[PDB]
Nucleic acid binder design. Structure first.
Lengths: 117, 64, 201, 37, 143
RNA sequence: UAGCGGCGAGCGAACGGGGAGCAGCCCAGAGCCUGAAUCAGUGUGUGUGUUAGUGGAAGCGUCUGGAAAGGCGCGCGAUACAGGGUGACAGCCCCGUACACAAAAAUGCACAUGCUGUGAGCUCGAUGAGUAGGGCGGGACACGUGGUAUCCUGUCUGAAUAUGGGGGGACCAUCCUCCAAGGCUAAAUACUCCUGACUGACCGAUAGUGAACCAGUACCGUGAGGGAAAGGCGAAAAGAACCCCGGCGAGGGGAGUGAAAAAGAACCUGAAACCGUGUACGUACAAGCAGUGGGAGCACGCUUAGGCGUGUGACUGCGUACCUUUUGUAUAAUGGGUCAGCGACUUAUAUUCUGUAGCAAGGUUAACCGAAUAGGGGAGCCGAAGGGAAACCGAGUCUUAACU
């Protein structure tokens, strides 16, 4: 029972090359380079599902720090204030209020300064 | 083929009742007047092949 | 145990050890796989590197060409080169122990009785050696795919079943596991039942 | 053409010449080796 | 039902296929480690080879000899001799019962379990315990 | 296994048992007696086989379709439903198959028979000499000179000859067995250049022969020798009349055939690398494994605006390929120009362990016979008993004068 291996090899190669559309040059044409490109894209994608949590958090902290200094207190003192005021709003939402609702953020700063004093 | 016995091992080990192998002790062929009689008396009975070496012996003696 | 005859409406007294035991599916599977393996004429050969029609001249010098080093034009890596582990004609027979063969037949006969795939007639013979007569006879008994097994091999029945595809006539001596399992219904003559019990003890 | 190309790739497969790389290519490898000693 | 028969559970184990991929577990080196004499095709040392140290079967002395006569002695239990068809036991009558072998010249009737019928043993050596066991269950031993 | 063995690596019997097959004879030598069985060579007759052959069952309607053997409906053959072809898949269209027959002639085999040659059978006698054996050297015996029997002989020698001689594993004696120094002999057995039939959990064009094709060719080499690549239009050539561009071209565009000519001979399918044309987006102040996480804008589709999907991707965080070998590689260490095809833990036989199945103090047969994967075949192997170097003893045994 000789098994020719044309049809299944074609299917594997094609699977990998479909996962590499949009890559520059051989990275999207040649199998032997698109295999490495697809794997290295896999490793980066893993690594960056962790980094997007780190990057979004540092973005939010920069926006709360900006808006809170606009209301006359730093980020450090603001988070200490709200923790002592026993407010448990996470900082995705504090960043989002700090962009969209300036008056609510002003009131949060008043709770923070009220408890912090 | 059929497995050939390592033939000079069959002359030196002999199988026992629970699968172990007995052998004659070394050191009792010549130079003998220098040895104590306590050595020589303790080298006369036959002895079991130790745990380390049964692998080798079973490999050399596949029909015994 | 008793087997109800189809036509005479009697009951044939059989052994419970032969026609009434359990189905040992593992045992039957071993005897079936072994029977089918015994049928393989294992005739084939590819050519190793030694048997390929070439020369043992080394195709280029060992060092200095920038080619990879090669030594024979009959290497298995080379096109036209000789199979690495080329096959030889081989025997595919398995030993089936005699008590495992008989055990397997006892299991399959017990399941042909238990699944109502076993029909016991008193006599089953055809008038003339015509396939038309056996076709009409099997049509009257509501049987299309059938293994007729008779204790004395009739000549006319054998010639009448030789063209019918689904139908096979055996003597009680030469039954095999794969036909008792293969055919939908097995129709044994009562004499064949007695001979089967003599074979399978 | 294909036959002449297979034979004319087969030209320096069994060579001997040591000062020429691969039988034919001129070099200075005699002086390179000799100076390395 | 030939497409419903199926083997036992545990009977057909897979079979190691070496050299296929990373997931399989045995790819690249097939389970034979890095370089060396043992990772080489044909590679391996011979039996009873300890590097060059003098092997165990060759640093120990040899003893004994083979008898020539122990190959024609036999050893009959008491579980048999109810198998001899006769109630009389000689070397033939045992050979005829496929119980010693044709080349056998000497036989002995070791106590190894449960004689019942009265047996007349003729021309065979009998051990002490089995003399008592043959004579206790009826029996007769002449020589 | 016993043994042989730098007692290493390894080599490795016989006796005895079971089967296949079975067959005995002649000369060394005279008389009686003849053609007496015996084969060999030939003629003839019979039987059978080979080399050409002959007959050989049984179907139509309708739907899809280029075409029907296909679907649906209703029939018939079968000692014939092995197979191949026919415009798709046919038991009934064709060739065949089962079955039943056929040879003017030449032949193979087997009986019968004619002739020739050959010799039966009886009594008595003989019963293989430079030979057996020996010394020296070497070889074959499983046996390597060893305590080495036995066989063969290059060299030197050398008997007895049935009141005799050979062997029985140094050797002697006793006992048993056999008759060398002359020869013939079927079957079981081994093999396939070559022919026929059939079969394949063999290959299907980089495979299978090196060779599916005018292949041991082209080609290479002084020579011996080495040694390729290369299959497939269509059901049928109906293989493109004629017209136009063009050099009375090449190539093309129509026309026509065709079910289909991106089925047009550079011909089934028609992948990938590689090269183009067209469209959307980005890209000419921006540094690096070229992605990834975020992400504006733009273009197409939507969408009861639901704010989505696809393509692109400014800008921005992070980010030095894969393999291999290594203490450690972005490494400026190895390998790879890319694609496509092939390319590496197999097979056989023994032995051990695990799983599983059968039977169980028993399990199982091998060769072979074979109604032949059945059933016979238990020769044998393994186990139920060990100890001891061995005799021997035996649930004990060995050690030892004997064992707390």
């Amino acid at each position: 029972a000789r098994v020719k291996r044309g049809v299944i090899a074609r299917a594997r190669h094609k699977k990998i090359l479909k996962q590499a559309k949009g890559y520059y040059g051989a990275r999207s044409r040649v199998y032997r380079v698109a295999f490495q490109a697809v794997i290295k894209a896999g490793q980066y994608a893993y690594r960056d599902r962790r980094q997007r949590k780190r990057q979004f958090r540092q973005l939010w902290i920069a926006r709360i720090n900006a808006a809170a200094r606009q209301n006359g207190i730093s980020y450090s003192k603001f988070i200490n204030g709200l923790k002592k005021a026993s407010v448990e709003i996470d900082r995705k939402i504090l960043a989002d209020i700090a962009v969209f609702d300036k008056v609510a953020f002003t009131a949060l700063v008043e709770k923070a300064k009220a408890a912090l004093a | 083929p059929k497995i050939k016995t390592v033939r000079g091992a069959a002359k030196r080990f002999k199988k026992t009742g629970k699968g172990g192998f007995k052998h004659k002790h070394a050191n009792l062929r010549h130079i003998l007047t220098k040895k104590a009689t306590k050595r020589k008396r303790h080298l006369r009975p036959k002895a079991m092949v130790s745990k380390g070496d049964l692998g080798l012996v079973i490999a050399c003696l596949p029909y015994a | 145990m008793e087997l109800v005859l189809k036509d005479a409406q009697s009951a044939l007294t059989v052994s419970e050890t032969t026609f009434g035991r359990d189905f040992n599916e593992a045992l039957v599977h071993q005897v079936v796989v072994a029977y089918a393996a015994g049928a393989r004429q294992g005739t084939r050969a590819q050519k190793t590197r030694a048997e390929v029609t070439g020369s043992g001249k080394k195709p280029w010098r060992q060092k200095g060409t920038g080619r990879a080093r090669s030594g024979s034009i009959k290497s298995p890596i080379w096109r036209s080169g000789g199979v690495t582990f080329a096959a030889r004609p081989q025997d595919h027979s398995q030993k089936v122990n005699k008590k495992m063969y008989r055990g397997a037949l006892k299991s399959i006969l017990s399941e042909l009785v238990r699944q109502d795939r076993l029909i016991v007639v008193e006599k089953f013979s055809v008038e003339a050696p015509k396939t038309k007569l056996l076709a009409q006879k099997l049509k009257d008994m509501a049987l299309e795919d059938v293994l007729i097994i008779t204790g004395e091999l009739d000549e006319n029945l054998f010639l009448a079943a030789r063209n019918l595809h689904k139908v096979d006539v055996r003597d009680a001596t030469g039954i095999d596991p794969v036909s008792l399992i293969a055919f939908d219904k097995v129709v044994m003559t009562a004499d064949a039942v007695k001979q089967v019990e003599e074979m399978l003890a | 053409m294909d036959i002449n190309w297979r034979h004319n790739q087969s030209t320096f497969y069994h060579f001997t010449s040591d000062h020429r790389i691969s039988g034919w290519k001129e070099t200075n490898a005699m002086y390179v080796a000799l100076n390395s000693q | 039902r030939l497409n419903t028969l199926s083997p036992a559970e545990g009977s057909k184990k897979a079979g190691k296929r070496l050299g296929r991929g990373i997931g399989s577990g045995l790819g690249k080196t097939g389970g034979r480690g890095h370089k060396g004499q043992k990772s080489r095709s044909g590679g391996g040392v011979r039996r009873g080879f300890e590097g060059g140290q003098m092997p165990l079967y060759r640093r120990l002395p040899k003893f004994g000899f083979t008898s020539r006569k122990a190959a024609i002695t036999a050893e009959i239990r008491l579980s048999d001799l109810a198998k001899v068809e006769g109630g009389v036991v000689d070397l033939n009558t045992l050979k005829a019962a496929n119980i010693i072998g044709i080349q056998i010249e000497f036989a002995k009737v070791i106590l190894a379990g449960e004689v019942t019928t009265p047996v007349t043993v003729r021309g065979l050596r009998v051990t002490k315990g089995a003399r008592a066991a043959i004579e206790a269950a009826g029996g007769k031993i002449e020589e």
